[PDB]
């Protein structure tokens, strides 16, 4: 069946409730003090993490080389706790997946597992008015309150939930190379 045990281990050790001016989002911690949140959360200079105001030391809204939104924002947080390093659970490449789980961690839903079934590399989506790339699709009627939700199969953390049209849901891909130590460049 679905990898419920894996999703639960990821929720236990690597998720927190994040709250911006746009409301609450499940937030996946990736390594050290680096986490991700859907870009439409509109992250600013500070953010609530588990209802604790926290300094946002960096925020990078990912876009691809066509200058198209990827709907992922990576943040660096001023907190004492380190996140378990889960980078080795991220996919190297784009892919399709079987029998995935969507897990939510908010105030309203502290832990929440939804089997969404098959996940297809959808590609381009006009995501409520914003052209977006690298989208994963599942045939499940996801709802408000689920954004940021972590999409997993066993051994792989494959994306975070960003939208849904009433019949399908949509996640932004997570790729391993989003989080490697790289080069020295001016990004703001
Ligand atoms: C989470 O903030 C929320 C989840 C949507 C909401 C309804 N059901 C879901 O799964 N995301 C959005 O509302 C999202 C925000 C954009 C700025 C990314 N917009 C959205 O989902 O629009 C509906 C739609 C999605 C895909 C094709 C056509 C319409």
Author numbering: 1 to 188
From the paper:
The Picornaviridae family of single-stranded, positive-sense, non-enveloped RNA viruses includes several pathogens of concern such as enterovirus-D68 (EV68). The 3C protease cleaves eight sites within the viral polyprotein, with a preference for a glutamine–glycine (QG) motif at the P1/P1′ positions, a preference distinct from host cysteine proteases. We have determined and analyzed three high-resolution inhibitor-bound crystal structures of EV68-3C protease, which revealed possible sites of resistance mutations, a key structural water molecule conserved during ligand binding, and the conformational flexibility of the catalytic histidine H40.
The resulting structures are all the same space group (P3 21 1), had a clearly defined electron density for the entire inhibitor, and diffracted to sub 2 Å, facilitating direct comparison. GC-376, a smaller inhibitor, formed similar hydrogen bonds, with several residues found in all three inhibitors. Across all three structures, interactions between the inhibitor and Thr142, His161, Val162, and Gly164 were conserved. Within the S1 pocket, the g-lactam ring extended beyond the substrate envelope into the solvent. Based on this observation, mutations at Gly166 or Ala144 could introduce a steric bulk, blocking the protruding P1 moieties and decreasing the inhibitor’s ability to bind without impacting substrate binding. From these data, we predict that GC-376 would have a higher barrier to resistance compared to rupintrivir or AG7404.
